[PDB]
């Protein structure tokens, strides 16, 4: 439930980070 939904929301943002520094 909220575990996969939570960690998931967290994963997306973690991508954005490495996606801005990584391009």
Q: Is 22 exposed, middle or buried (0-12, 13-18, 19+ CB in 10 A)?
A: exposed
Phi, psi dihedrals of residue 15, rounded to the nearest 5°: -65, -55
Residue with tokens 């575990």: 3
Q: What is the DSSP letter of 3?
A: H
Residue with tokens 């391009």: 23
What does each C-alpha distance from 6 to 3, 17, 20 come to in angstroms?
5, 17, 22
The sign of the torsion formed by the CA atoms of 14, 15, 17, 22 equals positive
Q: How far apart are CA 3 and CA 19, in angstroms?
A: 24
Q: How far apart are CA 9 and CA 12, in angstroms?
A: 5
């Amino acid at each position: 439930d909220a575990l996969t939904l939570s960690s998931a929301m967290w994963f997306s943002w973690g991508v954005l980070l490495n996606s801005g520094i990584g391009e």
